């Protein structure tokens, strides 16, 4: 009944897989015409992998839903509960009553139950069963109109045998949603749920790092029961009135938020940074010249291709500490609307490299950023290899830039400098006054600043103080804030007074304002830029 | 069936080498017994085609079947082990009766690692009765039954040792990635049912697809095809739409950029196509490696008559950037041996063994070890130890040569410089003004330089600039043209003015141009070419 109705507008969190695997079964399944005669092939093995919860079960039925095609569910465990004999006897019925009513989807629930790692099957039957799953995958004509999706966590769980040129050749990943993505599903999952007049969801979106489409709609069934809680509570069968009367407020959404475990904080996160030049300033010479090496390629390939000379993917940030490498790649990476990907020193040293550098490749305009570089160059040894294999086989065509952010540039192996892999060096100063001055008006862009702090005599009173120097200040500067609205309140209460952040609390945060930065090391670095 | 049995060897493509290799070793012995017989040839028994997913080798014993009129019986891996314990045997066994019974036949088992694989990966003991089974029945094939048993799998190793005894798998073959001529084919192969446009110039397209095989590019056509039909339907099904259709050369483009080959990562044993000219090169270098590779192959009756066996070791040292790869790619091209090239950093990643196996596969063959310093010196030491006993074992009858590169030559163990291992040492130096003439119009052949621009001067101009310099001046000299050309572009729009690369653009390309060795460095070598 239901199920027979689930279509696109019933997923959310995945929007360009969903436009791919349309395109790619959709199309030939409902006009195989124009297909047969170009001579486009259509896939016969699609694998759909990433993290769980993502609500990648319900795309072949979608599919399916959508194209007028027959469906077929085939659940590993299932299949697996089953005897000896009818585990085979079930696989052979599902690929026959699915090629009988052809067009039709078959769909493999947890390939990795039925087909694991030949290693990890120690008796004769599950071989006996990857095997009959084999030869029916082989058996299928290209003229049967039968398309075999299957669903897994990762796709080294399955067996080599299954990723062949002729079983499943497509591989796509559905991986944890961004802010659009998470504020569909919560679109989706709130339909039945009558909200309150203040609920603004986009907020709850930008706000659920790391959530998937599990961990929202259980987000929301926290926020209705904390809703539940407080008004049968304080209004404790429960009339009709009450029933009526709920609706979830924004501070139900709120304290769920706050008390949710997500369970995919610590997978990658491949996104289009929201950091603009505004937010970091940045001298002009460097703008340039991350621009020249990582917008032209990206925007004006032809430009490249009719001078005939391929350009570099190599950049190396070097200078003090806390002066916002990190923005800078987040910032260059969204002028060209490429994807980031970052990734820290001590995560590598916990293979792995090869799964990094595949995940940029797919994202075809990506900035991999490497951070703490020193940690890796000069465990280590097996990591610095790895990585200088994996950047001599990057295609220098192929729109994947690599840039490493390093605080002590002396130390890198100079392996890693070398041409081809990453040869331009770019140093990054302590800001100057304009720089310090946009560091600033961002830190405080979204706390109440009063109208006589100005923001410029601030910038001229601080002077090689790095970005994270001035975050301290401000942050100091809110603490005295806070405090002295507790202490008023506190009297009051014996007996707003602080509305915003006052002068005297930053020249009282400004007291104890410490460079981290000695002339001795700008001078180091100066030193290491001369020697370039 | 119609379609299988009437595929032939102009149907297979990528490799054409071996295919002649398994015309003379089958189809001959299969259609004139009664001259091999009267000679005294033993016809094999055993043929093992072993290479990368997707080459093609599957369609070979079929087409070898099919050319020389003899029956075919295929045998799957998966479908054999498949079954119940029993019916496994006697389906191998009434296999080997059919061949036996209508001869001359041919026996193909694909997947033979499914059927027979390392004695440590089994467990079960239905799965070692299989492959006593196929031993026994391999071993029971009379000399006069005209009955060739093939077989493919991915590696060679993954077989039990057994079966590539005497007797039953004697003969391997490889057909590994296909060179750009293989490539051509098959992109002709694909695209006999897809109507191709006038601009459509596949070898270009075979030349830029670097680690494809057979199924690549076959994707490659399909993806080509799509987004044609993408473009043509997305504003548009009407009949005239559907005979309007042809893949162009952008859409080929579009898809070789957008492709991920699955094959990257395989070592490459092809003739370079790197000659002289493009390295400059000194008389002396030129003269030394010609009577050291190139008098052994072109005259060795010379050296019979003369009686001393040549010696095949070569360590090249001289400043980074001097161009030592492209001196073995040169040398091996005027001789037209093939080229393998190892990096240090891929070796400290059994394997050493494969590759001087590899090496001696080709018989004339130049192998290349670049960054030999990071292996000896004075992990680490299982690698120099495997390669000095390799090197030891190769007889200097054999056309394989060895040469190493190293920046650093006082740093490599004396080992592998003794006398029969790598006894030729060569200075590469820093390019003299012709050889800088060279470099900078090899550079620059791909670009469009102004007539004005004149190579002699920049040469003059250039001296002590390593290879490396003299190409990081043609990139800045490029990309001062692509920004002058954007600019030009943004300013046309506000309201082709660069259509080659000027003068002024290398003028201040070399402003910031800067040597890479200093004169210490080269003092060094010197020392170190004088102390030899």
Not at 173 to 195: A, K, V, W
Not at 345 to 353: K, M, Q, S
Not at 397 to 407: C, D
Not at 501 to 508: M, N, S, V
């Amino acid at each position: 009944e239901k199920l027979n109705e689930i279509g696109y507008d019933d997923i959310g969190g995945c929007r360009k897989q969903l436009a791919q695997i349309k395109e790619m079964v959709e199309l030939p399944l409902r006009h195989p015409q124009l297909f047969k005669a170009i001579g486009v092939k259509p896939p016969r093995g699609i694998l759909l992998y990433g993290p769980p919860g993502t609500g990648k079960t319900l795309v072949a039925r979608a599919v399916a839903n959508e194209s007028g095609s027959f469906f077929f569910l085939i659940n590993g465990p299932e299949i697996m509960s089953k005897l000896a004999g009818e585990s085979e006897s079930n696989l052979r019925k599902a690929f026959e009553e699915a090629e009988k009513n052809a067009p039709a989807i078959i769909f493999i629930d947890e390939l990795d139950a039925i087909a694991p790692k030949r290693e990890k099957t120690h008796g004769e039957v599950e071989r006996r069963i990857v095997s009959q799953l084999l030869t029916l995958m082989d058996g299928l004509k290209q003229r049967s109109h039968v398309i075999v999706m299957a669903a897994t966590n990762r796709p080294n769980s399955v067996d080599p045998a299954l990723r062949r040129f002729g079983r499943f050749d497509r591989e796509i990943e559905i991986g944890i949603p961004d802010s659009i993505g998470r504020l569909e599903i919560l679109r989706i999952h709130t339909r039945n749920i009558r909200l309150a007049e203040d609920v603004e969801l986009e907020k709850i979106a930008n706000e659920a790092h790391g959530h998937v489409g599990a961990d929202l709609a259980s987000l929301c069934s926290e926020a209705a029961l904390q809703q539940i809680r407080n008004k049968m509570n304080l209004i404790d069968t429960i009339d009709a009135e009450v029933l009526n009367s709920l609706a979830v407020t924004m501070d139900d959404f709120r304290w769920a938020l706050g008390k949710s475990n997500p369970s995919a904080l610590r997978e990658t996160t491949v996104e289009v940074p929201n950091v603009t030049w505004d937010d970091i300033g940045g001298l002009e010479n460097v703008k340039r010249e991350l621009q020249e090496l990582v917008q032209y390629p990206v925007e004006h390939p032809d430009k490249f291709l009719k001078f005939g000379m391929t350009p570099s993917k190599g950049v190396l940030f070097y200078g003090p500490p806390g002066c916002g490498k990190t923005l800078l790649a987040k910032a260059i990476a969204n002028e060209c609307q490429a994807n980031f990907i970052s990734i820290k020193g001590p995560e590598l040293l916990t293979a792995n490299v090869r799964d990094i550098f595949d995940k940029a490749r797919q994202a075809a305009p990506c900035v991999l950023f490497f951070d703490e570089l020193d940690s890796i160059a000069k465990a280590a040894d097996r990591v610095i290899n790895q990585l200088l294999t994996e950047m001599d086989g990057m295609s220098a065509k192929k729109n994947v830039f690599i840039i490493g952010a390093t605080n002590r540039p002396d130390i890198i192996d100079g392996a890693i400098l070398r041409p081809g892999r990453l040869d331009q060096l770019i140093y990054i100063p302590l800001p100057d006054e304009a720089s310090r001055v946009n560091i600033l008006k961002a830190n405080l862009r979204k706390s109440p600043i009063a109208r006589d702090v100005d923001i410029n005599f601030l910038a001229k009173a601080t002077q090689g103080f790095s970005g994270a120097d001035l975050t301290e200040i401000c942050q100091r500067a809110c603490k005295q804030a806070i405090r002295e609205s507790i202490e008023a309140e506190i009297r009051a209460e014996s007996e707003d007074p602080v509305p915003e952040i006052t002068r005297r609390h930053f020249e009282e945060a400004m007291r104890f304002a410490r460079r981290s930065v000695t002339e001795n090391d700008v001078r180091k670095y100066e030193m290491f830029a001369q020697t370039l």
